[PDB]
């Protein structure tokens, strides 16, 4: 159960992992002349951006409740990817994602990781409300789930993780392409996806065409004084493309 990974300039491994299911079996690819909408020959940064980038350390505990991100927004700051995104009205990209989560032989607990589509998050508050841009687009900073006092609550998404933050049951979440970090089974987990939309390419900053969720399905523990472990995620964009070049987006 060993893998190595190589994209654009950068490489990844686990020597205790079971291979990704490729999302729907479709290995990532560029747009087709048969399906395209945009007229130009689009921007292929290739190796300089279909390469890995990784998020700030989250860390977790038995008390922890969940984390997620929305893409491409979660990668808006990833140099070439980030600006090439911000300077175009449109683009498209798939992703290779690996989540890094080693423990000792002496830990238990499990996370589910789900790649998830439009994942249209429900409000925290009841009634005539909807989610505000700052929170739907948390950037690489992401949304960890917490017990208390998130301001502007009327525009906040719900914290209700076991309702998938949208009023659907968890545990059926395995309907999406998914994996488990299980500390016995593996030390890491991986998933890869092509581009997807109802449209052949999309307004990157305006719509998170993919999203990624990680949930503490089983509580972290060990008897060791190292009561907590970080998690980090690395992503490479795939076949990344951009079209309608103009100024940098604000």
């Amino acid at each position: 159960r060993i893998i190595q990974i190589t994209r654009g300039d950068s490489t990844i491994t686990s020597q205790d992992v079971a291979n990704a299911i490729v999302a729907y079996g479709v290995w990532p690819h560029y747009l087709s002349s048969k399906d395209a909408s945009a007229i130009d020959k689009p921007s292929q940064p290739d190796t300089s951006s279909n390469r890995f980038y990784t998020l700030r350390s989250v860390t977790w505990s038995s008390s922890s409740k969940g984390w997620w991100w929305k893409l491409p927004d979660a990668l808006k700051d990833m140099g070439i990817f980030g600006e090439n995104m911000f300077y175009h009205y449109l683009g498209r990209s798939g992703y290779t994602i690996h989540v890094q989560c080693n423990a000792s032989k002496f830990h238990q607990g499990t996370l589910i990781v789900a790649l998830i589509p439009e994942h249209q998050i429900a409000s925290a508050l009841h009634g005539n409300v909807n989610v505000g841009y700052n929170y739907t687009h948390p950037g690489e900073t992401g949304r960890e789930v917490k017990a208390e006092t998130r301001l502007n609550p009327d525009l906040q998404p719900t914290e209700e993780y076991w309702l998938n933050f949208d009023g659907t049951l968890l545990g059926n979440i395995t309907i999406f392409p998914h994996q488990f970090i299980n500390l016995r089974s593996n030390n890491s987990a991986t998933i890869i996806a092509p581009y997807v939309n109802a449209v052949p390419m999309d307004s990157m900053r305006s719509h998170n065409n993919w999203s990624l969720v990680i949930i503490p399905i089983c509580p972290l523990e060990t008897s060791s004084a190292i009561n907590t472990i970080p998690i980090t995620i690395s992503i490479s964009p795939m076949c990344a493309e951009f079209s309608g070049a103009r100024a940098k987006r604000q």
Binding site: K105, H107, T110, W162, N182, L183, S185, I217, C218, S223
Partner: protein
């Protein structure tokens, strides 16, 4: 556990020298809790079902830890078992918790009729039942605990008829906008 992840999970007690029952469930696809699974809901959208069901189970405890466990099925017309040996007379699997993560096994289709009704009223399909085949053994100063997660899906055998507007969900009044 309901308002949380924990209703998907069960906790095991490495402290116990016993053969005894860990849990049990019905097998009728639109019974609680199974109805709440996506196969459950799809069955709940339907009136007839047929074919055998896949069930799967991960030893979510500490990697250093060992056990073997009994997962068993009860052909109905009879009460849900009350000894491990009762379940051993039923169709069952004993889980060699090797390096590999998961045991997976099937309730065989043993309906008299080629189909069964998806929701029982005053009716039954049989039971899932789970038991300590050995005691669970952690090595010393491991957490005095373990977790198990349980999965189901339709086998290649599985099918439905009489699509019906599902039991599972209710609308009261107007849906506001």
């Amino acid at each position: 556990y309901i308002n949380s992840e924990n209703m998907y999970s069960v906790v095991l007690q490495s402290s116990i020298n016993a053969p005894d029952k860990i849990f049990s469930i019905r097998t009728d696809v639109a019974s609680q809790p199974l109805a709440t699974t996506l196969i459950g809901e799809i069955s709940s959208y339907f009136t007839h079902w047929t074919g055998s069901l896949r069930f799967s189970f991960m030893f979510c405890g500490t990697a250093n830890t060992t056990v073997k466990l009994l997962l068993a099925y009860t052909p109905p017309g009879i009460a849900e078992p009350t000894t491990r040996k009762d379940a051993m007379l039923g169709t069952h699997v004993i889980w060699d918790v090797g390096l590999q993560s998961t045991i997976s096994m099937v309730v065989p289709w043993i309906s008299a009729s080629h189909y069964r009704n998806t929701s029982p009223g005053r009716s039954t399909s049989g039971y899932i039942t789970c038991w300590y085949q050995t005691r669970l053994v952690i090595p010393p100063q491991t957490p005095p605990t373990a977790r198990l997660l349980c999965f189901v899906s339709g086998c290649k055998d599985f099918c439905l008829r009489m699509a019906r507007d599902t039991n599972l969900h209710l609308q009261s009044g107007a849906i506001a906008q």
